[PDB]
């Protein structure tokens, strides 16, 4: 299906996009002294574009044409007004990014495309692990955030 | 799909409960003294156990919420009076955790829950390479039986 | 002697319960966030089943018949709504899993097993650290967490 | 001598049938449970395999033109029924595998064809040594089956 | 306590009197070609002696005035024509030390002569392994002894 071929090209435009979206949230918490979660943000940021890369690659083998989109400006910073807001951000951003992965999952198995589904496996159990990761991230900075100066005593940490 | 996580659910008991049957099995080795068989038995039921273990990691991580259940007293160990009888019981084991873990497999994939699916694939793997093992230590016992005080000869040599 | 036999049968499930207990703890802390806590659980419900396992190898040793009982479902972490009620589970396990020793040693000491009594020393000696680390934690945690978020900020810690 | 082309292109197809047969021979033992026994055969025939390679080499460097042929099913595996039937097989595989050998040889001899015949030496010396260990073998499987058991206790001990 | 000394020093004598029957069973064996069970007997003559010196030592040093009393001739050796008999010999050795030792500490116990206790632990507990080693080898050899040479078979392989 040249729809199949659609989703493969909208993850690549998925993980660039997350790519800059961590980017941004690396920027916010620069700007705001919080240079532990901002380190935390480029080095994910990176690891984005990593995936993005290896889904291009796997494409050009596999004679997927890809289309490189454009990579949209990140648009949450302009609302981001605590570290609780970006990392809620970057929890959605991840859950969104295992829809997709699930979506073009579901095609490749309509189709029968089991190289593109062997493909993709490790990159199910990835989001698995990233996914709980934000969201034990986002809780507790959820719980420090509640007395004053503590959330900040523990970007110290990492 | 309550019915995934349930059987999700479930498939950590059934890991569970071969960890007890394993260690029933190593006693009863011990109590007769074939300790080599003893010690195989031993190491997998920690096994199982780690098996178990997997699951319960995989899904915390996926929020699948895990209730743990009795695990059964094993009593397999009633009816054993010879290893055949132990080898036996224990290769239907293996082969029940097999068709559970296919049971799970279908259900995850009747959802379309892929990562599930990747989660489990080298559990299916892993399953033939145990009912390869174990079927062919229960041919050698059988066969080895045969001849009175053979079998302990090779309790020694082996494991 | 029976009852020393049936004292000692007992003292195998204490221990395999027991490692179920910690268990539903790790699971209860991973699900709340907790990692660290979590762990700490995890380990010990590992240590609780080679407990279980010493008792079991001695008892092959010595002929005394072993049947391995149901290990029952652990049933505290429905109660449970923060880490303080956890580790007061724990310690409560703990000086439950103390009495059920020295029941067995004065079981074993009734019939003078010096065998028995001898195995059991280390268990002993051993239950009494175990119960001043847990009373230790629990302490720590009772006090951590009379301000909102600073727990959090120690468990991330230790 | 078309005959000796001829004859040196057979010998590739006469290891590579080799090949086959052991490999046939390593499932049988593998389906029964003598993983000692299949690692044996699966080794060997990975070597005749090599052998036919080593025929197809020399070969192109002496502008002898190969053509592969068909590497026919092995069929002896239909009356296998024990370990005894399986090396019985075996031997005389390896006693066609000498005596087609020979046969090159001695085209080769009539030939004239003095680098053929070095080319050959070390397989002849090779078939005198396979021949035996394989002879040696079957005594002794032959003779450790006459007590039930008795074989299987050594597919562990040796192999 | 006066019964006390006596019975720590009887337990010297006890040591010594399971050396010689251990070595008295390693010359069975030897005479009779299990070189294997001869050297496990002849190790273990020679750490019930040094169980004995233990004995002494602490003796020594907890001023219980030791006394060397005869060593006993082994004559279980009389009545042996097999490696059965041998073992099960062996066996009741051992359950006889476990119950002196254990008539030891009820004296120590009765006198709360703790020192004594203590210094009994460690060999309560090696007792029980012994009696465990010792029976699961008698076992092995029993079942192997049903078949004409297999025992033999083994005396080679382990030991
Ligand atoms: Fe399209
Ligand atoms: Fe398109
Ligand atoms: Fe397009
Ligand atoms: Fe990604
Ligand atoms: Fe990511
Ligand atoms: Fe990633
Ligand atoms: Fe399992
Ligand atoms: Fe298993
Ligand atoms: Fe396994
Ligand atoms: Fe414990
Ligand atoms: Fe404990
Ligand atoms: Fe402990
Ligand atoms: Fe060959
Ligand atoms: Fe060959
Ligand atoms: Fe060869
Ligand atoms: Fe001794
Ligand atoms: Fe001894
Ligand atoms: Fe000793």
Chains 1, 3 share one sequence.
């Not at 493969?8 to 918490?29: D, G, M």
């Not at 990014?97 to 490749?108: D, G, K, P, Y």
Request: with cysteine.
């Amino acid at each position: 299906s040249e729809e199949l071929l659609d989703l493969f090209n909208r993850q690549v435009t998925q993980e660039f996009t997350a790519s800059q979206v961590y980017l941004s949230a690396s920027i916010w918490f620069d700007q705001n002294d919080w240079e532990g979660m901002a380190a935390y943000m480029l080095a994910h940021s990176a690891e984005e574009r990593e995936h993005g890369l290896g889904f291009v690659d796997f494409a050009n083998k596999r004679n997927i044409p890809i289309e490189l989109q454009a990579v949209p400006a990140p648009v949450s910073c302009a609302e981001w007004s605590s570290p609780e807001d970006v990392w809620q951000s970057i929890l959605e951003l991840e859950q969104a990014n295992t829809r997709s992965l699930l979506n073009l999952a579901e095609a490749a198995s309509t189709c029968h495309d089991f190289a593109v589904m062997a493909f993709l496996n490790p990159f199910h159990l990835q989001q698995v692990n990233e996914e709980d990761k934000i969201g034990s991230i986002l809780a507790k900075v959820t719980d420090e955030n509640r007395t004053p100066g503590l959330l900040r005593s523990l970007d110290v940490v990492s």
